[PDB]
Amino acid sequence: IEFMRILHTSDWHLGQNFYSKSREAEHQAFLDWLLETAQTHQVDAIIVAGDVFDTGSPPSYARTLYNRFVVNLQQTGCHLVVLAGNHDSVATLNESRDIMAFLNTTVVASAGHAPQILPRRDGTPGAVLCPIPFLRPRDIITSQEKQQHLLAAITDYYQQHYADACKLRGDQPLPIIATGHLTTVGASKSDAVRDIYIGTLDAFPAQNFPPADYIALGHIHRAQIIGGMEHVRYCGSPIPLSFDECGKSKYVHLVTFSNGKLESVENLNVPVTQPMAVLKGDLASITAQLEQQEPPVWLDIEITTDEYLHDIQRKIQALTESLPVEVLLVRR
Ligand SMILES: [Mn+2]
Ligand SMILES: [Mn+2]
């Protein structure tokens, strides 16, 4: 009879420089849709599980997108939790941490944040959240197998915070939600997913996560269930961040809890607003493929080599001209 609904998204990479193209229009459309979605489903909180910005120094238009989203979300009463990813700067996200607190927004950039009660819209306790961002090794490692040390450090961190969450919850029939931003064992990755913990942790075994009712992860751009556990998920990025993800569905998760436990995870399709395409073949294959839309499709021309990589450039740069589309990548 008591519900708690959250939206799980991650890997926005606001401000991404995509082959000299801006993603501002796509991100604007996405954030607008996310606002509408929060209202349609009467969502209590949105959790952004890391990699808010593509870099530690986002351009003004990206900072503006982020700020305006948080402001517009105030018309809903929905709470916002923003976690840092490995792409984010901790100092950059912390610039606005205390300001955001006046706008029903909890910015968690560094390790060590205590578990906190997420309210329902009506103010009453809805869930206990363990707000865990990308964990910088320096912030969790004790006293300097370095591989084994980091895995144990992360595992212990989750155990300590899960224990605190259980204590904070007390007797209340509340779900516990934990977040994270890392790569799990078995995860399927994309080109735009940068290696983390390089040399210190190949991947995190999801069996080491504490038994939260939901684990909202970011870092991996393709939505997927982890370790065969429906309650442990990557939502994936909301727009395609590399050509290898185009054509594939983009999601945010609607996660509903009932009487203190996970009830359902629904996959909400994020509308795709910028057409993209990857071509593979020969000059004639591509010429056939290049057949015949207001926003012009962005192209990646890939194949086996024809002749000098520089010569192929001018070849394709001639085959593409006066056409209703653009051409961003050309490899071999
Ligand atoms: Mn990312
Ligand atoms: Mn990441």
Side-chain angles (χ1 to χ4, degrees), residues 10-13 49-54 85-87 181 192-194 218-221 237 241:
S10 76
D11 297 284
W12 289 4
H13 289 262
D51 281 355
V52 181
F53 297 104
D54 192 58
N86 69 302
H87 281 246
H181 190 90
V193 183
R194 176 201 297 175
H219 181 51
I220 289 307
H221 294 174
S237 64
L241 296 175

Coordinates of all heavy atoms in Angstrom, one line a residue, residues 10-13 49-54 85-87 181 192-194 218-221 237 241, ligand 1:
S10 N 22.1 7.4 -15.7 CA 23.5 7.5 -15.4 C 24.2 7.9 -16.8 O 23.6 7.9 -17.8 CB 24.1 6.2 -15.0 OG 24.3 5.3 -16.1
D11 N 25.5 8.3 -16.7 CA 26.3 8.4 -17.9 C 25.7 9.4 -18.9 O 25.6 9.1 -20.1 CB 26.6 7.0 -18.5 CG 27.4 6.1 -17.6 OD1 28.6 6.4 -17.5 OD2 26.8 5.3 -16.9
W12 N 25.4 10.5 -18.4 CA 24.9 11.6 -19.2 C 26.0 12.2 -20.1 O 25.8 12.5 -21.3 CB 24.3 12.7 -18.4 CG 23.0 12.4 -17.7 CD1 22.4 11.2 -17.7 CD2 22.2 13.2 -16.9 NE1 21.2 11.3 -17.0 CE2 21.1 12.5 -16.4 CE3 22.4 14.6 -16.5 CZ2 20.1 13.1 -15.6 CZ3 21.4 15.2 -15.7 CH2 20.3 14.4 -15.2
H13 N 27.2 12.3 -19.5 CA 28.3 12.9 -20.2 C 27.9 14.2 -20.9 O 28.3 14.4 -22.0 CB 28.9 12.0 -21.3 CG 29.6 10.8 -20.6 ND1 30.9 10.8 -20.5 CD2 29.1 9.7 -20.0 CE1 31.3 9.7 -19.9 NE2 30.2 9.0 -19.6
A49 N 23.5 8.0 -11.6 CA 24.6 7.1 -11.0 C 25.9 7.4 -11.7 O 26.6 6.4 -12.1 CB 24.1 5.6 -11.0
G50 N 26.3 8.6 -11.8 CA 27.7 9.0 -12.1 C 27.9 9.3 -13.6 O 27.1 9.0 -14.4
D51 N 29.0 10.1 -13.8 CA 29.3 10.6 -15.1 C 28.3 11.6 -15.6 O 27.7 11.4 -16.7 CB 29.6 9.5 -16.1 CG 30.9 8.9 -16.0 OD1 31.8 9.3 -15.2 OD2 31.2 7.9 -16.7
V52 N 28.0 12.6 -14.8 CA 27.1 13.7 -15.1 C 27.7 14.5 -16.3 O 27.0 14.7 -17.3 CB 27.0 14.6 -13.9 CG1 26.0 15.7 -14.2 CG2 26.5 13.8 -12.7
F53 N 29.0 14.9 -16.1 CA 29.7 15.6 -17.1 C 30.7 14.8 -17.8 O 31.3 13.9 -17.2 CB 30.3 16.9 -16.5 CG 29.3 17.9 -16.0 CD1 29.1 18.0 -14.6 CD2 28.6 18.7 -16.8 CE1 28.2 18.9 -14.0 CE2 27.7 19.6 -16.3 CZ 27.5 19.7 -14.9
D54 N 31.0 15.0 -19.1 CA 32.0 14.3 -19.8 C 33.4 14.6 -19.2 O 34.3 13.7 -19.3 CB 32.0 14.5 -21.3 CG 32.8 13.5 -22.1 OD1 32.6 12.3 -22.0 OD2 33.8 14.0 -22.7
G85 N 30.8 10.3 -11.3 CA 31.4 9.2 -12.0 C 32.9 9.4 -12.1 O 33.5 10.4 -11.6
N86 N 33.6 8.5 -12.8 CA 35.1 8.7 -13.0 C 35.4 9.8 -13.9 O 36.5 10.4 -13.9 CB 35.7 7.4 -13.4 CG 35.3 7.1 -14.8 OD1 34.2 6.9 -15.1 ND2 36.3 7.0 -15.7
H87 N 34.4 10.2 -14.8 CA 34.7 11.4 -15.7 C 34.5 12.7 -15.0 O 35.0 13.8 -15.4 CB 33.7 11.4 -16.8 CG 34.1 10.4 -17.9 ND1 34.4 10.8 -19.2 CD2 34.1 9.0 -17.9 CE1 34.7 9.7 -19.9 NE2 34.5 8.7 -19.2
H181 N 29.4 3.2 -9.2 CA 29.8 3.6 -10.5 C 31.1 2.8 -10.8 O 32.2 3.2 -10.3 CB 30.0 5.1 -10.6 CG 30.3 5.6 -12.0 ND1 29.3 6.0 -12.9 CD2 31.5 5.7 -12.7 CE1 29.8 6.3 -14.0 NE2 31.2 6.2 -13.9
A192 N 33.0 3.8 -25.7 CA 33.0 5.0 -24.9 C 33.2 4.7 -23.4 O 33.3 5.6 -22.6 CB 31.8 5.9 -25.2
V193 N 33.2 3.4 -23.0 CA 33.5 3.1 -21.6 C 34.9 3.0 -21.3 O 35.6 2.0 -21.7 CB 32.7 1.8 -21.2 CG1 32.9 1.6 -19.7 CG2 31.2 1.9 -21.5
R194 N 35.5 4.0 -20.7 CA 36.9 4.1 -20.3 C 37.3 3.2 -19.2 O 36.5 3.0 -18.2 CB 37.2 5.6 -19.9 CG 38.6 5.8 -19.4 CD 38.7 7.1 -18.6 NE 38.4 8.3 -19.3 CZ 38.4 9.5 -18.8 NH1 38.6 9.7 -17.5 NH2 38.1 10.5 -19.6
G218 N 26.2 2.9 -12.5 CA 26.5 3.6 -13.7 C 27.9 3.2 -14.1 O 28.5 2.4 -13.4
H219 N 28.3 3.7 -15.3 CA 29.6 3.5 -15.9 C 29.6 2.8 -17.3 O 30.2 3.2 -18.3 CB 30.7 2.9 -15.0 CG 32.1 2.8 -15.7 ND1 32.7 3.9 -16.3 CD2 32.9 1.8 -15.8 CE1 33.9 3.6 -16.8 NE2 34.0 2.3 -16.5
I220 N 28.8 1.7 -17.3 CA 28.6 0.9 -18.5 C 27.4 1.6 -19.2 O 26.4 1.9 -18.6 CB 28.3 -0.5 -18.1 CG1 29.6 -1.2 -17.6 CG2 27.7 -1.3 -19.2 CD1 30.7 -1.0 -18.5
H221 N 27.5 1.7 -20.6 CA 26.6 2.5 -21.3 C 25.4 1.7 -21.9 O 24.4 2.3 -22.4 CB 27.3 3.2 -22.5 CG 28.3 4.2 -22.0 ND1 29.1 4.9 -22.9 CD2 28.5 4.7 -20.8 CE1 29.9 5.7 -22.2 NE2 29.5 5.6 -20.9
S237 N 23.6 4.6 -20.8 CA 23.5 6.0 -21.0 C 22.2 6.4 -21.7 O 21.6 5.6 -22.4 CB 24.7 6.5 -21.9 OG 24.6 5.9 -23.2
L241 N 26.6 7.4 -26.9 CA 27.8 8.2 -26.6 C 28.9 7.7 -27.6 O 30.0 8.3 -27.6 CB 28.2 8.0 -25.2 CG 27.2 8.6 -24.2 CD1 27.6 8.4 -22.8 CD2 27.1 10.1 -24.5
Ligands
MN1 MN 30.2 7.1 -18.7

